[PDB]
């Protein structure tokens, strides 16, 4: 069963929502802000939760061992980005380290590319599990490579100029419509990842 | 003491209170650090200007003395023969603490070598000899100018931040907490009349049922 | 913001000559005009000094540091302290045989207060 509670004005003050939360296992809250900005999937990634993550690892490891750790890393990235945003407004983005800007831009890229999707374009109607896995790998690998590169000493401002190409590549990766090979797409993603590594290595010079 | 939105808006106002507290503390500490760094800039610019006041005089007076020593002051030639500047100015970028500073740097410009003033013989060597000592105060002067600009920028920044903190503390928090109290009072008021109404209906029901079953004993 | 590329001076004859032989004040070939002026104590009118200041500040923005002797700057004290924009640098220096002048420096004057 997939119930659908209706907002009663206040976010959660209504008792029906409290009672449902008391029993329901998976909850997908609503975000006012994203709706105001036409970010159609308005799931708030701060309150929603699901308790079947614990058990689903048994299926995950049989086919895709990397979902748990990668998902946790993405959630940590998003939480860090939002908490930083909490304070950045009161002052301004002037006294920020390279890693801070990296995290902020990565979070923005994920939120505007990974999360967003319109249920009307053919390439975006249904996203298979494997495609989501590969596109997630792309983003997290990009982020960790950038973090490693800056950690060893470099100015991310200069590096970003070179990276713009691969950044656009990963941002456009979603447009790979499924239902073409179901495996050739995986090869394309692997080639993109290898080329990203190569481009960072050469540009890192 | 505000526009009064009474529609279960407590969470929003509490969030505003927390944000106000956080911003207040952060700006307080930022102002502390900026003032601490302002003090040292003041001291160092004072000392640099004071010592330059006499370093320049000794340099220029020695240059004039050597100019007279040859017996032929070269003021006219250096007044008409000079073509291009020996020093160029470049803007220096730096963030002393949080605030980004558009400081100035002593960008020497050796693109033009020492001016071709030597050639008079006795004074040809002495003019360039005293040029170096006369070319020494330029670096101190540009350092002093950079310190002056940094001083002005720091002063205005700290003034702005301090007044903003004072305004926040003395205006925002009272305004929001009074509204908090008002909202709490209204939400406490509603339940009172709701309870009265429920009590009315309950007493009506119990009284009528007791009356109806009273006769049933017979 | 590197439009101000030169340095102007309003100083006595010997100081200006030493400055020129070192060479910072450039006779601008582009304008055929010198941003450095040799001050004649008692001959150059305060109006001319104010005019050259106005040039170097508003019109000839090619000057970064507007140097002037403390004694000479005293004659334009009102002009000196009227202009309080930090983007163009203004430094005051002692004149020929004139010792260090603390009150003649507007920046130092402001420093002493609010301290």
From Swiss-Prot, chain B:
GO terms for biological process: endosomal lumen acidification; Golgi lumen acidification; proton transmembrane transport; vacuolar acidification. GO terms for cellular component: fungal-type vacuole membrane; Golgi membrane; membrane raft; proton-transporting V-type ATPase complex; vacuolar proton-transporting V-type ATPase complex; vacuolar proton-transporting V-type ATPase, V1 domain. Residues 206-218 have a biased composition (Basic and acidic residues). The keyword Nucleotidyltransferase does not apply. Its main location: membrane. GO terms for molecular function: proton-transporting ATPase activity, rotational mechanism. V-ATPase is a heteromultimeric enzyme composed of a peripheral catalytic V1 complex (components A to H) attached to an integral membrane V0 proton pore complex (components: a, c, c', c'', d, e, f and VOA1). Interacts with RAV1 and RAV2 components of the RAVE complex, which are essential for the stability and assembly of V-ATPase. This is V-type proton ATPase subunit D. It comes from Saccharomyces cerevisiae (strain ATCC 204508 / S288c) (Baker's yeast).
Swiss-Prot record, chain C:
The keyword Cell inner membrane does not apply. It is found in: Vacuole membrane. GO terms for biological process: endosomal lumen acidification; Golgi lumen acidification; proton transmembrane transport; vacuolar acidification. SUPFAM superfamilies: AtpF-like. It holds the Pfam family ATP-synt_F. Keywords: Hydrogen ion transport, Ion transport, Membrane, Transport, Vacuole. GO terms for cellular component: fungal-type vacuole membrane; Golgi membrane; membrane; proton-transporting V-type ATPase complex; vacuolar proton-transporting V-type ATPase complex; vacuolar proton-transporting V-type ATPase, V1 domain. Present with 4050 molecules/cell in log phase SD medium. Belongs to the V-ATPase F subunit family. Subunit of the V1 complex of vacuolar(H+)-ATPase (V-ATPase), a multisubunit enzyme composed of a peripheral complex (V1) that hydrolyzes ATP and a membrane integral complex (V0) that translocates protons. V-ATPase is responsible for acidifying and maintaining the pH of intracellular compartments. V-ATPase is a heteromultimeric enzyme composed of a peripheral catalytic V1 complex (components A to H) attached to an integral membrane V0 proton pore complex (components: a, c, c', c'', d, e, f and VOA1). This is V-type proton ATPase subunit F. It comes from Saccharomyces cerevisiae (strain ATCC 204508 / S288c).
């Amino acid at each position: 069963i997939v119930a659908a509670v209706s907002p009663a004005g206040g976010d959660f003050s209504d008792p029906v929502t409290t009672a449902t939360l008391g029993i329901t296992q998976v909850f997908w809250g609503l975000d006012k802000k994203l709706a105001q900005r036409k970010h159609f999937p308005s799931i708030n990634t701060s309150v929603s939760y699901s308790k079947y993550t614990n058990v689903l690892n048994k299926f995950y490891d049989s086919n895709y061992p990397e979902f748990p750790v990668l998902r946790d890393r993405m959630k940590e990235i998003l939480s860090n980005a939002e908490e930083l945003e909490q304070v950045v407004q009161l002052v301004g983005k002037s006294a920020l380290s390279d890693s801070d800007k990296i995290t902020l831009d990565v979070a923005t890229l994920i939120k505007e590319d990974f999360l967003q999707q319109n249920g009307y374009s053919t390439y975006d109607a249904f996203c298979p599990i494997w495609k989501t896995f590969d596109m997630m790998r792309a983003f997290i690998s990009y982020h960790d490579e950038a973090q490693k590169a800056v950690a060893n000493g470099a100015n991310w401002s200069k590096l970003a100029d070179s990276t713009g190409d691969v950044k656009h590549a990963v941002s456009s990766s979603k447009f790979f419509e499924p239902s073409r090979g179901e495996k050739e797409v995986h090869g394309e993603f692997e080639k993109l990842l290898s080329t990203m590594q190569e481009r960072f290595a050469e540009s890192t010079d | 003491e505000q526009v009064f939105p009474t529609r279960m808006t407590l969470g929003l106002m509490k969030t505003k209170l927390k944000g106000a507290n956080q911003g207040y503390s952060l700006l307080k500490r930022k102002s502390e650090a900026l003032t601490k760094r302002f003090r040292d800039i003041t001291k160092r610019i004072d000392d640099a200007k004071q010592k330059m006041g006499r370093v320049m005089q000794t340099a220029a007076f020695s240059l004039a003395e050597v100019s007279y020593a040859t017996g032929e002051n070269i003021g006219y030639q250096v007044q008409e023969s000079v073509s291009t500047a020996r020093f160029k100015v470049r803007a220096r970028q730096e963030n002393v603490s949080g605030v980004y500073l558009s400081q100035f740097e002593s960008y020497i410009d050796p693109e033009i070598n020492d001016f071709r003033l030597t050639g008079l013989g006795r004074g040809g060597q002495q003019v360039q000899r005293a040029k170096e000592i006369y070319s020494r105060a330029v670096e101190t002067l540009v350092e002093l100018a950079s310190l002056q600009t940094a001083f002005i920028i720091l002063d205005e920044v700290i003034k702005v931040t301090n007044r903003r903190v004072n305004a926040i503390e003395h205006v925002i928090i009272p305004r929001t907490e009074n509204t908090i109290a008002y909202i709490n009072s209204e939400l406490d008021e509603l339940d009172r009349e709701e309870f009265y109404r429920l009590k009315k209906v309950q007493e009506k029901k119990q009284n009528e049922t007791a009356k109806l079953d009273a006769e049933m004993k017979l | 913001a590197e439009k101000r590329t030169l340095i102007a001076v309003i100083a006595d004859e010997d100081t200006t000559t030493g400055l020129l032989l070192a060479g910072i004040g450039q006779i601008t070939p582009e304008t055929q005009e010198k941003n450095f002026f040799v001050y004649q104590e008692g001959k150059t009118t305060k109006e001319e000094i104010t005019d050259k200041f106005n040039h170097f500040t508003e019109e000839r923005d090619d000057i970064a540091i507007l140097l002037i002797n403390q004694h000479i700057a005293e004659n334009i004290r009102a002009r000196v302290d009227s202009f309080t924009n930090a983007f163009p640098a203004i430094l005051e220096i002692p004149s020929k045989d004139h010792p260090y002048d603390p009150e003649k420096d507007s920046v130092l004057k402001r420093v002493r207060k609010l301290f």
